[PDB]
Every structure is written in structure tokens, then in C-alpha cells.
Amino acid sequence: NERRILEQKKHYFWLLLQRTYTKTGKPKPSTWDLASKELGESLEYKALGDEDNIRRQIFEDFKPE
């Protein structure tokens, strides 16, 4: 069920990470360190506070466009 939730959040955090850092809007950070530093406020990145390694990993793998 958390697997089902994780996938839901996967898309929504990409929706969040894209909403913030889109194609042309904001460049997708070179490192998740600066990403999360600026990101920390939008609660969808708090949706993976217990699934940290997942969130860092998807962020990098997201790829805009």
C-alpha cells in the first residue's frame, strides 16, 4: 500500500519538482543538495521525508521536458 502511495507521490513529487524546476522555468539542479535546500518548503518533498533515498533518486532521474 505504501508502494501504491510511493508511486502516487513519485508522480506528484515530479509534478512538484517540475512545478518548481520546469524545462525553461528553473533548471533541474546539478546536485540534490542545492535542490533540497531550495525545495524544502513545498510539502511534496516532505512527502518523501521517510523515503529520502527514493526522492533524491527520482529527482535526479526526473529529466525535464
Side-chain angles (χ1 to χ4, degrees), residues 16-29 64-65:
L16 194 297
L17 202 327
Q18 178 188 90
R19 190 259 321 169
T20 311
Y21 310 146
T22 338
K23 338 188 175 183
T24 184
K26 288 296 170 180
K28 179 136 289 74
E65 194 63 83

Side-chain angles (χ1 to χ4, degrees), residues 1-4 6-8 10-12 21-22 24 26 28 33-34 38-40 42-43 47 52-53 56-57 64-65:
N1 176 263
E2 40 55 74
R3 284 316 199 247
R4 171 173 167 129
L6 190 63
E7 292 290 280
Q8 166 66 89
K10 196 177 264 175
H11 173 214
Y12 220 6
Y21 310 146
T22 338
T24 184
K26 288 296 170 180
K28 179 136 289 74
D33 170 75
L34 52 128
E38 204 74 274
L39 221 311
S42 300
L43 25 292
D52 182 299
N53 57 148
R56 34 173 17 131
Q57 199 44 210
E65 194 63 83

Side-chain angles (χ1 to χ4, degrees), residues 30-51:
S30 320
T31 317
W32 163 246
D33 170 75
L34 52 128
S36 51
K37 180 176 308 192
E38 204 74 274
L39 221 311
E41 183 177 77
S42 300
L43 25 292
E44 203 56 47
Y45 136 85
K46 229 187 312 188
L48 306 179
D50 194 55
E51 205 37 286

